Write a protein that binds this ligand. Structure first.
Ligand SMILES: [Zn+2]
Ligand SMILES: [Zn+2]
Lengths: 121, 124
């Protein structure tokens, strides 16, 4: 493994260490503590997920790496989705190089949502 | 400046995994908070990263989650053995079996006092 790959995994381990040793909530039970560690692993995974309400376009849920998030990219991708573009819709976004993919999904209760998944390239 | 066919295919696979978690989970309840939790768990499951945290005193897993494509039973066993033989930390491990993995391991002490061994693995 290369010098930069090793450097990057060491920086990720340091994020895990900070979560375990400094931020750990002593009041939480182990399953909550485990999910909080999960949150920190996904927070620097290069992946971001936005769930929008199909009716209003308003954000319902947002998870993952802020580094893979962009308000402008997500607005543009939602516009293509609402403009009947063939799904799933792809979008390359460079200002930072993101690849994103969007599609409508239907929750179990029928609630239509727009699902926008972004990735750092 | 545009994403390749392989980049597109890989991201489409992840989106379809997310769709499986929303539309094909027979036991997922309708409660909107419960839906957020399922999606967040599934995002980690294909993040290309896997994290194993073991109690140093017993060897028993305390936490395990992430992507199984990033995990190797054999590699983790070899890395854990290097940690327990007081190799210099953090310990790096490359591993191949078709796929090529990069893992890093270190001993830590959780805030509540538990001594743990941390095995972080990544798809190269
Ligand atoms: Zn912190
Ligand atoms: Zn969960």
């Amino acid at each position: 493994a290369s010098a930069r790959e090793r450097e990057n995994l060491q920086l990720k381990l340091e994020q895990i260490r900070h979560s375990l040793e400094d931020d750990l909530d002593l009041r939480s039970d182990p399953a909550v503590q485990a999910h909080a560690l999960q949150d920190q692993l996904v927070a620097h995974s290069g992946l971001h997920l936005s769930i929008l309400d199909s009716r209003s376009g308003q954000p319902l849920m947002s998870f993952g790496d802020q580094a893979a998030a962009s308000v402008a990219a997500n607005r543009a991708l939602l516009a293509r989705l609402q403009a009947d573009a063939r799904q799933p819709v792809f979008q390359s976004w460079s200002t930072q190089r993101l690849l994103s993919i969007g599609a409508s999904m239907r929750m179990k209760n029928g609630t239509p949502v727009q699902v926008l998944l972004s990735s750092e390239r």
